[PDB]
């Protein structure tokens, strides 16, 4: 149990950081798409899509 619980923390750290990087990536994805709507290239629906992401 000791060893198991020990490793679990590591794994959690891992997923944490990764999910973080994903966060930033998707974030500037949304920013790009947003600006793209601002110049009017695309439908609002995509904006809401990236929003949901």
């Amino acid at each position: 149990n000791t060893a198991t619980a020990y490793f679990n923390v590591l794994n959690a750290i891992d997923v944490l950081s990764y999910t973080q990087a994903q966060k930033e990536a998707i974030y500037r994805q949304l920013d790009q798409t947003t600006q793209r709507f601002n110049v009017g290239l695309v439908a609002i629906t995509d904006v809401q899509n990236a929003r949901a992401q």
């Binding site: 009017g40 290239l41 439908a43």
Partner: protein, 53 residues
């Protein structure tokens, strides 16, 4: 020759109908903010082209 152009005009007469119905049928949705002004600029101009033809 006049008969030749008499038919060749009849072609453009049909294509103008296509571009026009496509444009109005885009705008009627476009009051609900259809696919940006992009396709509206892709429709309003083509109709001008068929008009010039």
């Amino acid at each position: 020759t006049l008969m030749e152009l008499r038919a060749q005009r009849q072609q453009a007469e049909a294509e103008l109908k296509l571009a026009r119905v496509t444009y109005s049928r885009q705008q009627r949705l476009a009051q609900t903010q259809a696919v940006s002004q992009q396709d509206l600029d892709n429709a309003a101009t083509e109709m001008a082209v068929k008009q010039a033809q």
